[PDB]
Symmetry: C5
């Protein structure tokens, strides 16, 4: 399956909507930006579950002073996908891989 690089930046007032016209999106790591203030950050991913109902999960919790980067080592998800932050001014960078077969 062909692999491409994928990246996006998420802030307090901005979410990412990964949409496709089989495709898969696995997240390698989530990183904190230089300008992020000293407070907690929590990343959420919304996708499809087995019961045909959209769900929310917390991808990771990052903090500047504790753990600036948290690698999910490829958190595979079927698109469409929604990435959001519930707290933190950001920016936060989600780096993943877009797999198309």
């Amino acid at each position: 399956p062909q692999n491409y690089l994928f990246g996006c930046e998420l802030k307090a007032d901005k979410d990412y909507h990964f949409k496709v016209d089989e495709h898969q999106l696995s997240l390698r790591t989530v990183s904190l930006g230089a300008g992020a203030k000293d407070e907690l950050h929590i990343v959420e991913a919304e996708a499809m579950n087995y019961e045909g109902s959209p769900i929310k999960v917390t991808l990771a919790t990052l903090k500047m002073s504790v753990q600036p980067t948290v690698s999910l080592g490829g958190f595979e998800i079927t698109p469409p996908v929604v990435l959001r932050l519930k707290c933190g001014s950001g920016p936060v960078h989600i780096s993943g891989q877009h797999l198309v077969a």
Copy 2:
């Protein structure tokens, strides 16, 4: 297989039971919400319930741990050994027809 997103929130007084074709639960992340030990109970080789510590999180030290695809065969029970929480578990539900 079929890849679906799965997530749950665990507290001191709230367990989670995963029950459900072949199904698997691939945990990847356990993150502290806004000393917390997560326990997973499932079947062992010899056929009895077994309690294992999935991860330990702490606000001051490490709020999130990546299991890198900890596979479990359902049914499963996720609980918090200690700490009020909340603690968010996120992973992959694998369904094979």
Copy 3:
């Protein structure tokens, strides 16, 4: 076939009559030590992980495969080892 496996480290001898896939080591300075066979047919002592309460109490092994029999022990310093039994 995958089964959930765990133990608390005092030694632990895992023997089944198979593969043992270590995933996580958690704290309840500590070092987790593993004994199993090498290529040259001699046992070897290796540090699976080094943990400390105040700097990090958890380590993810990401599926460290070992062929049984194996022995786990605590070199220095309770801790919990969790992983998968594969048949």
Copy 4:
């Protein structure tokens, strides 16, 4: 397929460029011997063919100097750079070659 070692060094005034089926499985990003925030970024092809830059990792000596991307696969050509931090910063990983 064929598994070779790969490593490179990045600084404020030095980025690295990878040209050559070939693949780059980045494994670890480490801080060198020589307190500010460090950000390591990689840019490569997107699905629409538009070069995009993705923050590989954020490191800091006093908080955590090493990050493992567990083989983060990226198709060459690639460019790795430092958004911030004086460096030096070491990137290591695999080079996959298929005959």
Copy 5:
């Protein structure tokens, strides 16, 4: 193929050499024994010349262990402590086919 346990102790003064029915070294974890330490692994590259790459950088007061999760290297391989007094423990898998 077959997998065996593998490990070594890297000293500040003494490096470790690995030589050898096709064999791989799947490095898993690098840890501190009982200052700033850096581990280096050298082997062949795609141009047929040895290279130096930093496996990890460890410090007692920040984080004394890091897991690479299957860093595969084709032998022969040389591991060495670029800096730090050590000792440093390397653990991993030796894969034989």
